[PDB]
């Protein structure tokens, strides 16, 4: 608040924001983030999750 990754990602055009309380930075896009950006952050310790918008909670009776 503000995270270092948020600004560096924004200053290069990515719609990044701090997720809730943080420290996770979230990027929304229609195209994937270049691997070089991801692998750069991976070597500082960040774990990258490439996610989709999910559906509602699911309950199944067994």
């Amino acid at each position: 608040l503000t995270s270092e990754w948020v600004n560096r990602l924004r200053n290069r055009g990515y719609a990044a924001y701090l997720s809730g309380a943080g420290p996770t930075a979230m990027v929304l896009s229609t195209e994937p983030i270049p691997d070089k950006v991801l692998e750069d952050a991976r070597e500082s310790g960040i774990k990258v999750l490439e996610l989709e918008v999910a559906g509602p909670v699911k309950v199944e009776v067994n």
Partner: protein, 180 residues
Amino acid sequence: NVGRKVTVTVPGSSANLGPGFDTLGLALSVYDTVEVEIIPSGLEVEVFGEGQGEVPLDGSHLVVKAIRAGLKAADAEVPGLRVVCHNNIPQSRGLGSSAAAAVAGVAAANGLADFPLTQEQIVQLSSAFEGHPDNAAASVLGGAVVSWTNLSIDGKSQPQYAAVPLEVQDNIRATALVPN
């Protein structure tokens, strides 16, 4: 009701926090799973994945508490529970893990009791665990949700949580940079 078993799969969520009265939460494709079987009696709790070994395993656990709150809301009772959690949502990372847990617990209870609770009822109950609907509403409804809190009682304050679903374009993708 002995041997009845439900399995709940709940998405994490992400909310951009700000000064605004209304908050948007986005449900994301990283999931916690809770399996709940009604056992002869007692309470058995297991947690694997995120939080494994880190959390006490009894009626203190958030999920168990949520189930008992949900069973009460469903106006039902069990002799005993086996609660097995497999967590894949990173904890304390802003990805709505605690909210997802509460939601999963209420949803599980709802399923045990043959689904008497409305969607708003589950949003209202799960949000009350955190005191805000930001993540919980997104975990319940899925997709993108706008939520807010009305301080409207009689009997004040008694927060009333509301949430409305938005439909997101199919091509929108989320990438989380989760620090260790």
